[PDB]
Amino acid sequence: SMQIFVKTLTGKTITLEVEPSDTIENVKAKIQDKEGIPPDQQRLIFAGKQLEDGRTLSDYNIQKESTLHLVL
Amino acid sequence: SMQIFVKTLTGKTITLEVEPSDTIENVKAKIQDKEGIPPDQQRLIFAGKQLEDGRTLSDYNIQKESTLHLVLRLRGG
Amino acid sequence: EQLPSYRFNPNNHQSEQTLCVVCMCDFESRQLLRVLPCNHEFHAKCVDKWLKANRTCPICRADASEVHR
Amino acid sequence: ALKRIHKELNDLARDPPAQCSAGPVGDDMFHWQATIMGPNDSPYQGGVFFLTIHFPTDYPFKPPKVAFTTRIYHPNINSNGSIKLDILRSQWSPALTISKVLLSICSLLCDPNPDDPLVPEIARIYKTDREKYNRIAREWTQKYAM
Ligand SMILES: [Zn+2]
Ligand SMILES: [Zn+2]
């Protein structure tokens, strides 16, 4: 279990509690819980790549205290 | 009177005491005093854009706790 | 190649610079540092390699073969 | 080179900029992908632009090779995504991390050089019909970058 961060270009940074095995879809559901943004409106980027729903955080080498970008 | 942050060419971040009315020129002079880089070689970036000499922090909507990014003078071509 | 050099003492600083921007690693005790005429400091090994192909300070672009008045 | 590149991968992770993101492709530390968010209050606003980055084996003594994958309308960036910018060539300095390079490129979008352009026709439109330039840049952002 770990924490990762999600930033909006102008927005604040939010903290998510996740696991390496969490899918991108899972992460979007977590963002929806906190921010109210529907998953279908969310595009997540990490390390120059758009993140795909079926993949997990570990697939992207996302680890403790990684920061993701949310684009709407 | 407020303080902002500059991420310098050493990757370290320094704190500056400024006024919303201070010009970019003034800010670069304060950076020079700490970092020893002449204003002519400094390029400051905020919100993805260069900050031009002659304008003020307030002109750019730069508030307290804002972070400016220092890179080297550049030109497209 | 004759530019001043000295060995870093973390307990006695001759300047305010802690880090080499070429390798992005800290100055450590006894490391040989090279100081350009503009007063910017680096590991000698790192900046000497840059100065073989280039005349300029990585930080300020000042010409290292000229004196900055 | 690899130690310096790993540092920067770490520099980004400890202090990620809101404007850009970058990291290796397929765990190859010499080949990265990046994103730049178009600056707000510009024709590129709202756009997400993708780039490729290839670090030379002698980095940081030579600059990274950086190019856009996303089409973008600009006097200094051509139809292949090649960026003609001094810090990527003669004015390179090892003090510039890939984070500072990406921020520098972002800052180029609203600060073109139309006098020594990579794309002369776009430079002419920029200087002589700026409203048309802005229109086209906004339309390309909407089409390619969103
Ligand atoms: Zn070094
Ligand atoms: Zn210097």
mmCIF file of C-alpha atoms and ligand atoms in Angstrom:
data_model
loop_
_atom_site.group_PDB
_atom_site.id
_atom_site.type_symbol
_atom_site.label_atom_id
_atom_site.label_comp_id
_atom_site.label_asym_id
_atom_site.label_seq_id
_atom_site.Cartn_x
_atom_site.Cartn_y
_atom_site.Cartn_z
ATOM 1 C CA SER A 1 0.000 0.000 0.000
ATOM 2 C CA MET A 2 1.277 3.459 -0.904
ATOM 3 C CA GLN A 3 0.372 7.018 -1.738
ATOM 4 C CA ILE A 4 0.579 8.757 -5.068
ATOM 5 C CA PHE A 5 -0.304 12.295 -6.064
ATOM 6 C CA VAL A 6 -2.425 13.677 -8.863
ATOM 7 C CA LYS A 7 -2.039 17.237 -10.182
ATOM 8 C CA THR A 8 -4.235 19.395 -12.384
ATOM 9 C CA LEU A 9 -2.356 22.021 -14.402
ATOM 10 C CA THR A 10 -3.958 24.855 -12.408
ATOM 11 C CA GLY A 11 -5.450 22.649 -9.705
ATOM 12 C CA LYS A 12 -4.250 21.609 -6.282
ATOM 13 C CA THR A 13 -2.534 18.295 -5.726
ATOM 14 C CA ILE A 14 -4.567 15.470 -4.264
ATOM 15 C CA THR A 15 -3.304 12.388 -2.494
ATOM 16 C CA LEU A 16 -4.551 8.912 -3.297
ATOM 17 C CA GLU A 17 -4.024 5.746 -1.299
ATOM 18 C CA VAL A 18 -3.375 2.927 -3.761
ATOM 19 C CA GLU A 19 -1.638 -0.395 -4.336
ATOM 20 C CA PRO A 20 0.809 -1.241 -7.159
ATOM 21 C CA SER A 21 -1.775 -3.753 -8.381
ATOM 22 C CA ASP A 22 -4.475 -1.069 -8.718
ATOM 23 C CA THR A 23 -5.713 -0.605 -12.282
ATOM 24 C CA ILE A 24 -5.891 2.814 -13.924
ATOM 25 C CA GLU A 25 -9.686 2.405 -13.898
ATOM 26 C CA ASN A 26 -9.478 1.908 -10.127
ATOM 27 C CA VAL A 27 -7.435 5.076 -9.795
ATOM 28 C CA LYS A 28 -9.965 7.053 -11.835
ATOM 29 C CA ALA A 29 -12.719 5.781 -9.543
ATOM 30 C CA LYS A 30 -10.678 7.073 -6.605
ATOM 31 C CA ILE A 31 -10.352 10.483 -8.260
ATOM 32 C CA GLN A 32 -14.117 10.495 -8.875
ATOM 33 C CA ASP A 33 -14.770 9.801 -5.193
ATOM 34 C CA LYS A 34 -12.738 12.826 -4.122
ATOM 35 C CA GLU A 35 -13.173 15.275 -7.024
ATOM 36 C CA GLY A 36 -16.512 14.255 -8.541
ATOM 37 C CA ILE A 37 -15.047 13.968 -12.053
ATOM 38 C CA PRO A 38 -16.506 11.024 -13.952
ATOM 39 C CA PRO A 39 -13.867 8.496 -15.100
ATOM 40 C CA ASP A 40 -14.825 9.024 -18.760
ATOM 41 C CA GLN A 41 -13.799 12.689 -18.434
ATOM 42 C CA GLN A 42 -10.385 11.822 -16.980
ATOM 43 C CA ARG A 43 -7.164 11.432 -18.886
ATOM 44 C CA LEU A 44 -4.218 10.460 -16.735
ATOM 45 C CA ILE A 45 -0.599 11.002 -17.710
ATOM 46 C CA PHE A 46 2.554 9.717 -16.078
ATOM 47 C CA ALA A 47 6.101 10.038 -17.349
ATOM 48 C CA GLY A 48 5.029 11.344 -20.741
ATOM 49 C CA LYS A 49 2.497 8.565 -21.338
ATOM 50 C CA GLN A 50 -1.301 8.449 -21.385
ATOM 51 C CA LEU A 51 -2.403 5.740 -18.962
ATOM 52 C CA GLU A 52 -4.683 2.929 -20.178
ATOM 53 C CA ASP A 53 -7.605 1.714 -18.056
ATOM 54 C CA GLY A 54 -6.779 -2.007 -18.003
ATOM 55 C CA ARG A 55 -3.127 -1.595 -17.009
ATOM 56 C CA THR A 56 -1.957 -1.308 -13.401
ATOM 57 C CA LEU A 57 0.246 1.229 -11.626
ATOM 58 C CA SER A 58 3.140 -1.228 -11.515
ATOM 59 C CA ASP A 59 2.937 -1.650 -15.301
ATOM 60 C CA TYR A 60 3.848 2.036 -15.587
ATOM 61 C CA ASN A 61 6.565 1.890 -12.923
ATOM 62 C CA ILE A 62 4.421 4.096 -10.719
ATOM 63 C CA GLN A 63 5.706 3.781 -7.182
ATOM 64 C CA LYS A 64 5.482 5.429 -3.786
ATOM 65 C CA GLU A 65 5.020 9.193 -4.058
ATOM 66 C CA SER A 66 4.837 9.246 -7.854
ATOM 67 C CA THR A 67 2.943 12.194 -9.297
ATOM 68 C CA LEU A 68 0.371 11.811 -12.079
ATOM 69 C CA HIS A 69 -1.126 14.543 -14.225
ATOM 70 C CA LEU A 70 -4.891 14.789 -14.699
ATOM 71 C CA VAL A 71 -6.115 16.373 -17.913
ATOM 72 C CA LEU A 72 -9.821 16.940 -18.495
ATOM 73 C CA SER B 1 5.401 42.502 0.747
ATOM 74 C CA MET B 2 5.584 38.772 0.055
ATOM 75 C CA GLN B 3 7.935 35.900 -0.706
ATOM 76 C CA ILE B 4 8.120 33.726 -3.799
ATOM 77 C CA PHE B 5 10.318 30.817 -4.808
ATOM 78 C CA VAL B 6 12.735 30.375 -7.683
ATOM 79 C CA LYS B 7 13.945 27.006 -8.857
ATOM 80 C CA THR B 8 17.461 27.953 -9.887
ATOM 81 C CA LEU B 9 19.995 26.462 -12.283
ATOM 82 C CA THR B 10 21.326 24.265 -9.473
ATOM 83 C CA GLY B 11 17.884 22.704 -9.124
ATOM 84 C CA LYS B 12 17.774 24.139 -5.603
ATOM 85 C CA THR B 13 14.921 26.463 -4.717
ATOM 86 C CA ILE B 14 15.586 29.877 -3.204
ATOM 87 C CA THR B 15 13.205 32.264 -1.460
ATOM 88 C CA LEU B 16 12.921 35.905 -2.481
ATOM 89 C CA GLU B 17 11.310 38.766 -0.596
ATOM 90 C CA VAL B 18 9.375 40.872 -3.105
ATOM 91 C CA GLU B 19 6.474 43.253 -3.710
ATOM 92 C CA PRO B 20 3.700 42.618 -6.242
ATOM 93 C CA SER B 21 4.901 45.860 -7.859
ATOM 94 C CA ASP B 22 8.505 44.709 -8.331
ATOM 95 C CA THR B 23 9.575 44.448 -11.965
ATOM 96 C CA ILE B 24 10.966 41.269 -13.499
ATOM 97 C CA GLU B 25 14.214 43.215 -13.912
ATOM 98 C CA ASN B 26 14.268 43.741 -10.139
ATOM 99 C CA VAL B 27 13.601 40.060 -9.504
ATOM 100 C CA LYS B 28 16.447 39.056 -11.831
ATOM 101 C CA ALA B 29 18.749 41.418 -9.932
ATOM 102 C CA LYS B 30 17.838 39.660 -6.674
ATOM 103 C CA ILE B 31 18.512 36.318 -8.350
ATOM 104 C CA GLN B 32 21.902 37.588 -9.555
ATOM 105 C CA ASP B 33 22.848 38.590 -6.016
ATOM 106 C CA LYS B 34 22.312 35.012 -4.869
ATOM 107 C CA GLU B 35 23.252 32.936 -7.943
ATOM 108 C CA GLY B 36 25.820 35.104 -9.753
ATOM 109 C CA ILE B 37 24.053 34.846 -13.118
ATOM 110 C CA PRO B 38 23.672 38.144 -14.976
ATOM 111 C CA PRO B 39 20.061 39.122 -15.718
ATOM 112 C CA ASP B 40 20.949 38.960 -19.448
ATOM 113 C CA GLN B 41 21.375 35.175 -19.152
ATOM 114 C CA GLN B 42 18.282 34.572 -16.985
ATOM 115 C CA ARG B 43 14.963 33.437 -18.426
ATOM 116 C CA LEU B 44 12.133 33.226 -15.908
ATOM 117 C CA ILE B 45 9.100 31.047 -16.620
ATOM 118 C CA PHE B 46 5.705 31.037 -14.907
ATOM 119 C CA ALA B 47 2.543 29.304 -16.159
ATOM 120 C CA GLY B 48 4.536 28.078 -19.150
ATOM 121 C CA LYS B 49 5.503 31.543 -20.433
ATOM 122 C CA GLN B 50 8.593 33.757 -20.223
ATOM 123 C CA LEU B 51 8.413 36.772 -17.929
ATOM 124 C CA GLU B 52 9.399 39.952 -19.747
ATOM 125 C CA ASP B 53 11.546 42.756 -18.386
ATOM 126 C CA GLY B 54 9.462 45.876 -17.831
ATOM 127 C CA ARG B 55 6.480 44.116 -16.296
ATOM 128 C CA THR B 56 5.646 43.410 -12.663
ATOM 129 C CA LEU B 57 4.901 40.275 -10.658
ATOM 130 C CA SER B 58 1.320 41.523 -10.308
ATOM 131 C CA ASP B 59 1.008 41.932 -14.089
ATOM 132 C CA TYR B 60 1.579 38.193 -14.283
ATOM 133 C CA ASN B 61 -0.769 37.342 -11.416
ATOM 134 C CA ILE B 62 2.170 36.036 -9.424
ATOM 135 C CA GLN B 63 1.065 35.711 -5.805
ATOM 136 C CA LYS B 64 2.711 34.771 -2.516
ATOM 137 C CA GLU B 65 4.287 31.306 -2.483
ATOM 138 C CA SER B 66 4.414 31.192 -6.296
ATOM 139 C CA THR B 67 7.345 29.338 -7.851
ATOM 140 C CA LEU B 68 9.217 30.802 -10.821
ATOM 141 C CA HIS B 69 11.425 28.578 -12.963
ATOM 142 C CA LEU B 70 14.865 29.878 -13.940
ATOM 143 C CA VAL B 71 16.296 28.560 -17.202
ATOM 144 C CA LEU B 72 18.985 29.940 -19.536
ATOM 145 C CA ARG B 73 18.418 32.683 -22.083
ATOM 146 C CA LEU B 74 17.205 31.017 -25.310
ATOM 147 C CA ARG B 75 16.121 31.872 -28.847
ATOM 148 C CA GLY B 76 14.214 29.829 -31.397
ATOM 149 C CA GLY B 77 15.554 29.716 -34.905
ATOM 150 C CA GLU C 1 43.416 24.125 -18.003
ATOM 151 C CA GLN C 2 45.273 26.396 -15.583
ATOM 152 C CA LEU C 3 42.048 27.722 -13.989
ATOM 153 C CA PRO C 4 42.023 27.746 -10.182
ATOM 154 C CA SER C 5 41.268 24.517 -8.330
ATOM 155 C CA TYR C 6 40.857 23.605 -4.663
ATOM 156 C CA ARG C 7 39.663 20.738 -2.495
ATOM 157 C CA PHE C 8 36.214 21.071 -0.943
ATOM 158 C CA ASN C 9 35.979 21.412 2.826
ATOM 159 C CA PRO C 10 32.404 21.005 4.084
ATOM 160 C CA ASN C 11 33.441 22.561 7.406
ATOM 161 C CA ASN C 12 35.089 25.564 5.770
ATOM 162 C CA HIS C 13 33.333 26.992 2.745
ATOM 163 C CA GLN C 14 35.097 29.344 0.373
ATOM 164 C CA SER C 15 31.749 29.985 -1.355
ATOM 165 C CA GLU C 16 27.980 29.303 -1.268
ATOM 166 C CA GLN C 17 27.846 26.608 -3.959
ATOM 167 C CA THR C 18 27.167 23.034 -2.741
ATOM 168 C CA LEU C 19 26.604 21.060 -5.927
ATOM 169 C CA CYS C 20 28.056 20.291 -9.373
ATOM 170 C CA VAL C 21 25.521 21.054 -12.125
ATOM 171 C CA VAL C 22 27.307 18.860 -14.672
ATOM 172 C CA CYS C 23 26.791 15.561 -12.770
ATOM 173 C CA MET C 24 24.075 16.963 -10.489
ATOM 174 C CA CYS C 25 25.910 15.555 -7.429
ATOM 175 C CA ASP C 26 26.983 17.311 -4.239
ATOM 176 C CA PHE C 27 30.472 18.558 -3.523
ATOM 177 C CA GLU C 28 32.038 16.110 -1.042
ATOM 178 C CA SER C 29 35.001 16.520 1.301
ATOM 179 C CA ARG C 30 38.394 16.604 -0.479
ATOM 180 C CA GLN C 31 36.925 16.538 -4.011
ATOM 181 C CA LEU C 32 38.875 18.692 -6.459
ATOM 182 C CA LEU C 33 36.771 21.594 -7.607
ATOM 183 C CA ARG C 34 37.448 23.888 -10.537
ATOM 184 C CA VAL C 35 36.487 27.543 -10.334
ATOM 185 C CA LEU C 36 35.880 29.570 -13.483
ATOM 186 C CA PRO C 37 36.617 33.329 -13.786
ATOM 187 C CA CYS C 38 32.919 34.050 -13.205
ATOM 188 C CA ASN C 39 33.316 32.322 -9.832
ATOM 189 C CA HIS C 40 31.050 29.369 -10.606
ATOM 190 C CA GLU C 41 32.366 26.086 -9.199
ATOM 191 C CA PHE C 42 32.113 22.474 -10.384
ATOM 192 C CA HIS C 43 33.913 19.192 -9.930
ATOM 193 C CA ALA C 44 37.154 19.584 -11.897
ATOM 194 C CA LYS C 45 36.650 16.218 -13.640
ATOM 195 C CA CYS C 46 33.168 17.232 -14.793
ATOM 196 C CA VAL C 47 33.700 20.795 -15.936
ATOM 197 C CA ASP C 48 37.123 20.111 -17.450
ATOM 198 C CA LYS C 49 35.416 17.670 -19.832
ATOM 199 C CA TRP C 50 32.896 20.341 -20.826
ATOM 200 C CA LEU C 51 35.693 22.881 -21.310
ATOM 201 C CA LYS C 52 37.602 20.603 -23.685
ATOM 202 C CA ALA C 53 34.854 21.101 -26.273
ATOM 203 C CA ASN C 54 33.442 24.469 -25.111
ATOM 204 C CA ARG C 55 34.737 27.791 -23.765
ATOM 205 C CA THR C 56 31.769 28.717 -21.621
ATOM 206 C CA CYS C 57 30.479 28.456 -18.074
ATOM 207 C CA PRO C 58 27.547 26.003 -17.923
ATOM 208 C CA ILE C 59 25.750 28.303 -15.477
ATOM 209 C CA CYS C 60 26.298 31.827 -16.866
ATOM 210 C CA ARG C 61 27.866 31.292 -20.303
ATOM 211 C CA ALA C 62 30.809 33.554 -19.364
ATOM 212 C CA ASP C 63 33.894 32.769 -21.464
ATOM 213 C CA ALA C 64 36.242 30.847 -19.207
ATOM 214 C CA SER C 65 39.297 31.915 -21.213
ATOM 215 C CA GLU C 66 38.534 35.591 -20.535
ATOM 216 C CA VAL C 67 38.368 37.602 -17.309
ATOM 217 C CA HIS C 68 34.911 38.867 -16.322
ATOM 218 C CA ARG C 69 35.350 42.386 -14.946
ATOM 219 C CA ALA D 1 25.368 9.505 -18.939
ATOM 220 C CA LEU D 2 23.077 7.021 -17.230
ATOM 221 C CA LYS D 3 23.775 8.257 -13.703
ATOM 222 C CA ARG D 4 22.918 11.829 -14.753
ATOM 223 C CA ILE D 5 19.762 10.645 -16.563
ATOM 224 C CA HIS D 6 18.663 8.643 -13.527
ATOM 225 C CA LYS D 7 19.198 11.752 -11.363
ATOM 226 C CA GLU D 8 16.816 13.638 -13.629
ATOM 227 C CA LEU D 9 14.251 10.871 -13.538
ATOM 228 C CA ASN D 10 14.611 11.382 -9.765
ATOM 229 C CA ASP D 11 14.568 15.206 -10.040
ATOM 230 C CA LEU D 12 11.236 14.890 -11.822
ATOM 231 C CA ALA D 13 9.777 12.490 -9.259
ATOM 232 C CA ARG D 14 10.687 14.673 -6.265
ATOM 233 C CA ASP D 15 9.716 17.957 -7.935
ATOM 234 C CA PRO D 16 7.350 17.359 -10.895
ATOM 235 C CA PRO D 17 6.323 20.523 -12.826
ATOM 236 C CA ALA D 18 2.631 21.062 -13.564
ATOM 237 C CA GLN D 19 3.454 21.945 -17.176
ATOM 238 C CA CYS D 20 5.206 18.795 -18.362
ATOM 239 C CA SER D 21 5.882 15.124 -17.695
ATOM 240 C CA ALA D 22 8.589 12.809 -18.981
ATOM 241 C CA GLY D 23 10.135 9.387 -18.517
ATOM 242 C CA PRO D 24 11.702 6.386 -20.260
ATOM 243 C CA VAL D 25 10.039 4.251 -22.933
ATOM 244 C CA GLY D 26 10.190 0.498 -22.270
ATOM 245 C CA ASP D 27 12.773 0.968 -19.500
ATOM 246 C CA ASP D 28 15.305 2.300 -21.956
ATOM 247 C CA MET D 29 16.829 5.213 -20.086
ATOM 248 C CA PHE D 30 18.200 6.757 -23.309
ATOM 249 C CA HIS D 31 14.781 6.989 -24.991
ATOM 250 C CA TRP D 32 12.017 8.977 -23.288
ATOM 251 C CA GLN D 33 8.565 10.282 -24.037
ATOM 252 C CA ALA D 34 7.253 13.631 -22.751
ATOM 253 C CA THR D 35 4.138 15.783 -22.578
ATOM 254 C CA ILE D 36 3.844 19.556 -22.530
ATOM 255 C CA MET D 37 0.586 21.259 -21.633
ATOM 256 C CA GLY D 38 -0.130 24.195 -23.923
ATOM 257 C CA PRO D 39 0.170 27.462 -22.010
ATOM 258 C CA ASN D 40 -3.065 28.976 -20.730
ATOM 259 C CA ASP D 41 -4.227 32.167 -22.442
ATOM 260 C CA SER D 42 -2.647 31.251 -25.778
ATOM 261 C CA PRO D 43 -3.684 29.525 -29.017
ATOM 262 C CA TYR D 44 -2.274 26.295 -27.564
ATOM 263 C CA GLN D 45 -4.314 26.407 -24.375
ATOM 264 C CA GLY D 46 -5.924 23.108 -23.418
ATOM 265 C CA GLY D 47 -3.682 21.125 -25.727
ATOM 266 C CA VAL D 48 -1.547 18.211 -24.587
ATOM 267 C CA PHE D 49 1.499 17.847 -26.819
ATOM 268 C CA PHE D 50 3.605 14.690 -26.966
ATOM 269 C CA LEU D 51 7.360 14.641 -27.628
ATOM 270 C CA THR D 52 10.169 12.124 -27.966
ATOM 271 C CA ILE D 53 13.538 12.518 -26.278
ATOM 272 C CA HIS D 54 16.731 10.707 -27.173
ATOM 273 C CA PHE D 55 19.697 11.273 -24.888
ATOM 274 C CA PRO D 56 23.133 10.888 -26.509
ATOM 275 C CA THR D 57 25.632 8.485 -25.012
ATOM 276 C CA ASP D 58 27.755 11.505 -23.997
ATOM 277 C CA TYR D 59 24.943 13.378 -22.260
ATOM 278 C CA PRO D 60 25.113 15.896 -20.688
ATOM 279 C CA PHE D 61 28.112 17.063 -22.720
ATOM 280 C CA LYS D 62 25.810 17.091 -25.760
ATOM 281 C CA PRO D 63 22.127 18.052 -25.782
ATOM 282 C CA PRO D 64 19.137 15.699 -25.815
ATOM 283 C CA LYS D 65 17.411 15.261 -29.164
ATOM 284 C CA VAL D 66 13.838 16.465 -28.646
ATOM 285 C CA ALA D 67 11.017 16.484 -31.187
ATOM 286 C CA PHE D 68 7.236 16.839 -31.145
ATOM 287 C CA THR D 69 5.101 13.843 -32.090
ATOM 288 C CA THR D 70 1.919 15.933 -31.921
ATOM 289 C CA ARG D 71 1.463 18.323 -34.838
ATOM 290 C CA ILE D 72 1.747 21.940 -33.739
ATOM 291 C CA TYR D 73 1.612 25.251 -35.632
ATOM 292 C CA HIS D 74 4.698 27.412 -34.940
ATOM 293 C CA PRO D 75 7.493 29.163 -36.855
ATOM 294 C CA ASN D 76 10.262 27.176 -35.110
ATOM 295 C CA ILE D 77 8.742 23.676 -35.249
ATOM 296 C CA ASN D 78 8.328 21.905 -38.610
ATOM 297 C CA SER D 79 5.911 19.280 -39.986
ATOM 298 C CA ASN D 80 8.180 16.499 -38.709
ATOM 299 C CA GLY D 81 8.059 17.942 -35.204
ATOM 300 C CA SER D 82 11.682 19.077 -35.383
ATOM 301 C CA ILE D 83 12.369 21.981 -33.036
ATOM 302 C CA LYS D 84 14.971 24.535 -34.052
ATOM 303 C CA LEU D 85 16.007 26.097 -30.796
ATOM 304 C CA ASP D 86 19.446 27.323 -29.734
ATOM 305 C CA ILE D 87 19.665 25.428 -26.430
ATOM 306 C CA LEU D 88 19.181 22.165 -28.348
ATOM 307 C CA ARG D 89 22.156 23.030 -30.504
ATOM 308 C CA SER D 90 24.983 25.569 -30.152
ATOM 309 C CA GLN D 91 23.691 27.174 -26.937
ATOM 310 C CA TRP D 92 23.279 23.904 -25.033
ATOM 311 C CA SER D 93 24.561 23.821 -21.445
ATOM 312 C CA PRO D 94 24.872 20.767 -19.181
ATOM 313 C CA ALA D 95 23.168 22.836 -16.471
ATOM 314 C CA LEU D 96 19.870 22.340 -18.300
ATOM 315 C CA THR D 97 17.979 19.309 -17.069
ATOM 316 C CA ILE D 98 15.324 17.692 -19.264
ATOM 317 C CA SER D 99 12.730 19.351 -16.987
ATOM 318 C CA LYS D 100 14.267 22.769 -17.739
ATOM 319 C CA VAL D 101 14.493 21.873 -21.432
ATOM 320 C CA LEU D 102 10.785 20.971 -21.570
ATOM 321 C CA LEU D 103 9.862 24.172 -19.717
ATOM 322 C CA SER D 104 12.088 26.100 -22.134
ATOM 323 C CA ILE D 105 10.316 24.522 -25.100
ATOM 324 C CA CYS D 106 6.944 25.349 -23.534
ATOM 325 C CA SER D 107 8.109 28.978 -23.213
ATOM 326 C CA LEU D 108 9.154 28.997 -26.892
ATOM 327 C CA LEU D 109 5.524 28.422 -27.979
ATOM 328 C CA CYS D 110 4.581 32.024 -27.146
ATOM 329 C CA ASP D 111 8.008 33.482 -27.896
ATOM 330 C CA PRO D 112 8.817 32.433 -31.491
ATOM 331 C CA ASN D 113 11.604 33.703 -33.678
ATOM 332 C CA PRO D 114 9.972 34.651 -36.969
ATOM 333 C CA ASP D 115 13.153 36.266 -38.342
ATOM 334 C CA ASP D 116 15.313 33.130 -38.525
ATOM 335 C CA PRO D 117 12.416 30.664 -38.798
ATOM 336 C CA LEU D 118 12.319 26.924 -39.363
ATOM 337 C CA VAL D 119 9.034 27.351 -41.297
ATOM 338 C CA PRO D 120 9.189 30.561 -43.365
ATOM 339 C CA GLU D 121 5.526 30.632 -44.434
ATOM 340 C CA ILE D 122 4.330 30.419 -40.844
ATOM 341 C CA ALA D 123 6.790 33.189 -39.866
ATOM 342 C CA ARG D 124 5.374 35.434 -42.575
ATOM 343 C CA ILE D 125 1.811 34.858 -41.356
ATOM 344 C CA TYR D 126 2.896 35.442 -37.755
ATOM 345 C CA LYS D 127 4.410 38.816 -38.580
ATOM 346 C CA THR D 128 2.004 40.072 -41.255
ATOM 347 C CA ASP D 129 -1.370 38.592 -40.262
ATOM 348 C CA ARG D 130 -1.185 37.687 -36.617
ATOM 349 C CA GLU D 131 -4.905 37.107 -36.232
ATOM 350 C CA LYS D 132 -4.717 34.479 -38.969
ATOM 351 C CA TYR D 133 -1.691 32.878 -37.252
ATOM 352 C CA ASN D 134 -3.616 32.713 -33.953
ATOM 353 C CA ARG D 135 -6.668 31.238 -35.681
ATOM 354 C CA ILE D 136 -4.658 28.470 -37.332
ATOM 355 C CA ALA D 137 -2.657 27.653 -34.177
ATOM 356 C CA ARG D 138 -5.902 27.399 -32.180
ATOM 357 C CA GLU D 139 -7.511 25.218 -34.873
ATOM 358 C CA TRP D 140 -4.461 22.881 -34.954
ATOM 359 C CA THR D 141 -4.530 22.650 -31.146
ATOM 360 C CA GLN D 142 -8.198 21.633 -31.217
ATOM 361 C CA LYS D 143 -7.642 19.129 -34.022
ATOM 362 C CA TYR D 144 -4.331 17.477 -33.011
ATOM 363 C CA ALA D 145 -3.803 18.208 -29.307
ATOM 364 C CA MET D 146 -7.230 17.564 -27.775
HETATM 365 ZN ZN ZN E 1 30.332 16.835 -11.118
HETATM 366 ZN ZN ZN E 2 29.590 31.215 -14.559
#
